[PDB]
Design a protein around this ligand. Structure first.
Ligand SMILES: O=C(O)[C@@](O)(c1ccccc1)C1CCCC1
Length: 288
């Protein structure tokens, strides 16, 4: 598409912000608020529509995990509710295959889900599929060659270096090689033939390291680290480069946005969000 959209997030409380960054000119645009504040959500795009999935509203008047799916139309600048999921999922991971949205893991109160469900926009309906082999919240999810990957997270007791792959035509999950680092709340995306895992929380410290999984070799290799340690960052890919947005570094909620160029193996700061925040949902689509 053309713009990087960041939805929701957390600073002092869950946020309703929707804002769009244009890499071509540096500009930020503030768009229509979410109907309900939420942090720990995921964003994705299908057919030119932005989707905000899951999360939690951490507010003065109580804390509510979200099962919500909401749809944003850039042409109209209006959010609309979509069918809710079977279960609330805070710290969710999402991926898109063949126009279907997969919602992975996340938490509801003290329940850490291994369950997974799939949304079909043409029917506005969610169906459960096979659950993951491991409960995961703060899981990173990405898609490559019509396969879905769940990376890292927290199972309710331990933070994880493990990862697994979902094979849709077999409705089956299989473990892949574990990462070299334990990561909860990492940004996970795909570029070329690799699954990238950036930042996160390893139990003791927020991370700046970044590693990538080559699906052909089945090995993880570290690349250059980000300039800022961060967990609960937003990530996306835009014209062959990785963007990381916000996060928590153990001291500050970051407004920093960094961009990774895989050809030079370098990160640079490219812009700042209008305010620091973690737990945002991010996606890329057309300009409104
Ligand atoms: O990294 C984190 O777990 C968070 O930033 C977060 C916040 C909102 C949603 C997900 C995650 C923590 C909030 C309390 C301190 C940091």
């Amino acid at each position: 598409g053309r713009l990087i959209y960041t939805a929701g997030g957390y600073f002092r409380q869950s946020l309703s912000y929707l804002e769009a960054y244009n890499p071509s000119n540096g500009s930020w645009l503030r768009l229509a608020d979410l109907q309900v504040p939420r942090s720990g959500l995921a964003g994705c795009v299908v057919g030119g529509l932005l989707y905000a999935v899951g999360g939690r509203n951490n507010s003065p008047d109580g804390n509510t995990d979200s099962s919500a799916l909401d749809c944003y139309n850039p042409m109209t600048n209006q959010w609309s509710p979509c069918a809710s999921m079977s279960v609330p999922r805070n710290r969710i991971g999402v991926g898109v295959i063949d126009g279907h949205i997969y919602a992975v893991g996340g938490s509801h109160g003290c329940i850490h889900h291994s369950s997974v469900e799939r949304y079909e926009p043409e029917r506005d309906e969610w169906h459960l599929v096979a659950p993951m082999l491991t409960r995961r919240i703060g899981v990173g999810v990405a898609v490559l060659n019509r396969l879905l990957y769940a990376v890292g997270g927290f199972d309710g007791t331990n933070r994880l270096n493990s990862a697994e792959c979902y094979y849709p035509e077999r409705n089956e999950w299989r473990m892949i090689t574990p990462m070299n680092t334990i990561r909860s709340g990492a940004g996970v995306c795909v570029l070329h033939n690799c699954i990238y895992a950036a930042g996160g929380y390893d139990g003791q410290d927020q991370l700046n390291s970044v590693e990538r999984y080559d699906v052909e070799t089945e090995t993880w290799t570290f690349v250059a680290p980000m300039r800022h340690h961060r967990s609960a960052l937003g990530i996306t890919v835009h014209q062959g480069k990785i963007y990381v947005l916000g996060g928590y570094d153990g001291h500050t909620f970051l407004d920093s946005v960094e961009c990774y160029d895989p050809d030079s193996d370098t990160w640079s700061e490219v812009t700042r969000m209008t305010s620091g925040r973690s737990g945002v949902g991010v996606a890329v689509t057309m300009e409104p």
